[PDB]
């Protein structure tokens, strides 16, 4: 490949951090979260579980060190997700372990910015009843850091929900996809925790 | 750069997989999809095509092998998208080939998680008529794997649509951006296919 | 690690580009944008500022060169965001500098596709008043390239907003999260600029 | 076994690279991709998922060092895939984690060329509807590096799709199998990402 | 040509690195970035896109090995950009793929320093409105590694913006060109990402 | 992207100036300054500090050189502010370091004209007392080059203050926003220094 | 064809050099450059871009080896440009990627001399204003190696500009076409770079 | 002429071999031989000599080196036979030195292939007696390398004898022209020598 | 398919030649050229460019080897144009790169004869003025090998121009379509070059 690029990955991977938040100063890490709802694959009336094929856009900035002076070189490199720390975002009410559709690869930038987009199929609790009716049905699932409080991780969203990718001839039509950010509390801890509640309204076409 | 990081990329890239889904056991790959609608650049009344500047958040987990024992080292590395497998998510009704705004870089994590966020301008079919009226106009585009059925790839969404990034003084105001996941069928195949339908309601401000 | 992977990162990073848009021919770069609203952490009545914990899914394609003939090898690599060029997407009305929750890692693919997902906490202007009422309150923030016009960068969104990740017991319930793409103009320049307006309607549960 | 062969594997494995792309100079890694569609095992109308039994031919060249002077000796050796870096190629819309039919073994050549062919069963989103009709049904799935952009990994194909291996008495007849290479962009990143879209048209015989 | 020079290129190109960051030790790669704004070619009111003809100065240091003892010989050689790794710097909000005005050639120095300057035309989102007014209009575009976080790639700037080259009789007068460096975060990743925001204030003369 | 645009940026950035005022002949650089007062976020009675969310329109002309003959090509390009020289305009009485809301991107034009518009939150000294009264309260802050005298930098304003963007439901109503240009002297130096005094009269609505 | 000719091409192509400057001794490579201005196709007043249909005469000598003793045989052969190294000559200010009118074929001679003449349409920056006036308008574009300094590549011209081929009934009359050679410097490098500035004065007939 | 062609001849002639067989590896040189019998000019009964006007097609491949990278250029050049090595093919039983009708020019090809066709008048021993009879008369002459054994030079023939060119109103009619290849031995040497025996049967018309 | 046919393609493609002119003996390659003018799609008065939809009939004979004895089998096979060498015929004055309407497939025959017919849209320089007049307008474009001289490639035509296919209700009526063969010279080279000048006289009906 390119030798210049080669040095970059090795320096960051070999020299530049183990799993530890590199930021010493006054910063929580914000992670932008967006959902591209690909398809609502299936509904289970007996189980009251619904399946979503989604990919999640995750963006964050990590502190990286510039060592060897940056010359005009390879700006973004791609690396396996395993190589770097990723956020704990989880669906609060998944019925089953989510499965991963896509390769675990993340693009990293010199500024430290990282973009990771997994594709996933998730089963979440939701009653399908009245899917056939014109009114349709509503489901909600909340995503957010399991462990991190708002102080440690701040979640942000650019927009409501990305319908564009949605499969044209999906079994179910999308009434409205929303991603509203909310902060709430748990009995364990005094700290506020932030999650993104994805509320999807859909019916069978 | 850092030698420790250096070894990481090379081991994953040189030793650890060619384009092949690394997961042998009972897992489909789920890809989370989210849309950050940046701007609705233009509307064409004669053509009935509309232009969106979007970035797509894609997340997936790939199986990677740990070889050399992981010491505290570079957790995420960045690499070009070309280096690793990426999902086939496509807009079902694009008028033209989408163009890429941003560098193709993806951040990868040790767990195998990958985050890839492309920025794109897409032209899709949509009638602009009555954009001026208070009611505004509605458009929908579905994104989803072209080839993969729900069994192979499951799509998931965290939330509806990310408005926050939306340009303040865009030509068109955003009534509501939604990303609803749906599964549907095609005559070619008995399998369900999942797509995320992005339904955007907008009018000129 | 894997030697095969090793060569990949170095070739792309060391040999294959400095910060410069590699695409000579007729292409703007499109960046798909999606928001996964994790949580609405806090509201400040006196300040009229609201905090969102979000992650942003960003996807783009960069032109990379294949040098050493691609054998079946490591498809995605992960690299720090600093290594590669990332888009300038910014919140138009942030009160404060956004902080980064997650590591800056991006997965890159051989096709050149990059996925970067940062996690972020952002403070934006928004009046909280009447959060308690049933009607709730509405806020909007626009994200989009600061410098780039629609010609340089096109933004696209798959869906409205990803609620699924939203934290279950967040302080505030999500009425609806939307990401509508819009294009608008500024007095500085004749060119259209595209942004994604994230409109979030929420109330306290 | 043969002592001469013995030295070869150990030298390459023990001495000659960890996961790191070994190529410093001006080369992206190209990976040739071909599909041998073995069978379309099943179609699921409710799920809209289809199952393919495929093996994927992956070829790439890695840089290896000649140390001990090459005498006429064992030209190709076989080794477990785990030993060396493999590409991240993933199906964009797999419903589930792909499972692996065959042993993970790859033949390597002195020139550095590697041939790895996994056998896989993949579930992908696709509507089966109208499978019985004469017209049949069409499905598409895209394979490509998740993380790597076109700059890092370039994908190439020799031909359209390999029908010859196709099971004679499969439940479904093959109208046409195609593998067209395409490059596209994502909102995350400005870089182009390349994927191979496998479009399969089939009907029940 | 000169035989002495001849050996130099071949040794570096043939022997001395594939795409891999060559730096093992504690160094991120810093890439200096500067903009020479040549001209603001056009403004599009309907599209809200603006066109800039720019060349980008990119400088970085790669680790090269001295083999054959350096005698007084050819100090810099020139080579095609394809030969060596280049950074992923991309415009965050380009509407279209940037096109390349100049040959892709980069001068390399013995110390390892590389200077690459592409000339480019870029279309970026920006509202032209009020270009005629005395106040003029402001546009901003951010450039930075797509994939690389601040840890992998550090971006630096010598000065604000180079007006000197600016075309004398350009359609639009330059009020002020600024390049301020900033670091920000994305929802995907905890790491900080650094970008250079080019803010250009211009009006029609 | 577009190759034509590509050459432009590289030529200006790589070849066409480091931080140095390119103008040899009889010209001071004039920088037009305008304020768009977005919002008066907060008032602190104990501290006597007030917060303004503003964006500053800055325009200047830099001398650029035309090299490769300008063909009809990309007229404006966008670049990070870091790439080019920007003026030192500072608020004389900021209590704290101003924070930057927007990406640092500036549009540059062929004529050399540059438009840069940062968005900022600034804390300045000002007594809030009697904000509730009908009379309201007055505050003033002066912006101007710290180092540059009137001879080096001349500041100009098109109009008084831009209220239009002002947030409709801001905590404080705007009685009158004024930007009067004035020149004054300091004990350090015999030269006149020019600043723009922003006098804002506001009260709580 | 002729067997004698057959051996010639194969020997030079198969045996006699890869991309590397074959000249070891004290020689820079001189490339003669001449322009045959075919037509000025169009002028764009809004864009300030002008289109030229040109063919470029390029001549250089490469070192080739005589192997099989040269008998009276085929003196020049023709081959695709891809087969052999060609110079990087580029227009400094092209707005867009130049397009190629003619086949890429170059005649090579036994002495090593090569003649390559591409036909091209180029868009370059140039103000058309006052094209109608008797005075007409002047435009200039500079061509020259992007990477190569005067030491590596020396450019030479036989004459001013070739009008003879100029289309008789072109939209624009040619006042004077000039090709003056000049050497100039760039901030990147201490070395002199040589370019041919084509200054064309034309008006509408 | 063409400069490109010019370099070719000089490189091959000046740099690329003196009379020496350039092929080091396991190859004899094969020379294809064909005869185009133009005319049987005269018969001498007392002398028993017959005159043939023939041209001989000779083809061989020489190893040439490619130096300066082959661009699309002049594919075959022509050169005097003196310039390159030619085979020793001689008529075994010529009564007199053969005379040369045509210019000694040979076409050479890039692959190294050379085609040389001399035109010659040869006097060979042959009894004319019974030329008038219906049976006619037969003559044979053998051509082949004088010095070279079959190991050094291998002779090949495509076909029997080329009558087409034969002069229509020649004094003698051609019954049959044959060129059979044969290998035979001589007392001097143990090696086999190969010759082409031209057996011509002709009578007076 | 047919096994007999199968062997044929593989033998010719796999065994029987790489890009090299297979003919060693005294033959230039003649390529017959014919034009079937399908339609004159458009005329551009400002640009002085005209668009032709044409298909080009190209015929040539290549030397192929018969290996396995030809039995009565598949006489012509079809193959992609990429598989075999095609001539460099180019339009001398195309304004833009020609685009290809039809699949690149060529029929090959056992004798070695190949027939390739591309469909193309070409933009060429031509003044449209007086298209409306009865006299109409004349345009000419020359097609011919770019690199090859008359010695290497000889062009032949069967007839003047094929009107029969011409679209009945085309915007422009065809006065006369002619294809005259001519040979001419260029300053680069002493050799004659042959081209077919297509002179089309047309007017609006």
Author numbering:
A (entry chain A), B (entry chain A), C (entry chain A), D (entry chain E), E (entry chain E), F (entry chain B), ...: 1 to 205
Sentences from the paper on this structure:
They are homo-pentamers and water soluble homologues of the extracellular, pentameric ligand-binding domain (LBD) of the membrane-bound nicotinic acetylcholine receptors (nAChR) that belong to the Cys-loop receptor superfamily. The resulting cryo-EM structure is a regular pentagonal dodecahedron ∼22 nm in diameter and assembled from twelve ring-like pentamers; each pentamer measures 7–8 nm in height and width and comprises a central channel that is ∼2 nm in diameter.
Recombinant BgAChBP1 formed small particles that we interpreted as pentamers, and much larger particles that are indistinguishable from the native rosette-like protein. We docked twelve copies of the homology-modeled BgAChBP1 pentamer into the 6-Å cryo-EM structure. In addition, BgAChBP1 shows an unprecedented opportunity for a third disulfide bridge, C16↔C64, connecting loops L1 and L3. This bridge is lacking in all other studied members of the Cys-loop receptor superfamily, and it is also absent in BgAChBP2. These specific reinforcements of the N-terminal region of the BgAChBP1 subunit might be required for withstanding the stretching forces inflicted by the other three elements that form the inter-pentamer bridges: (iv) salt bridge D25↔R63 connecting loops L1 and L3 of two subunits from adjacent pentamers; (v) salt bridge R3↔E70 joining the N-terminal end of helix α1 and loop L3 from two subunits of adjacent pentamers; (vi) a central hydrophobic cluster of three F71 residues delivered from three different pentamers.
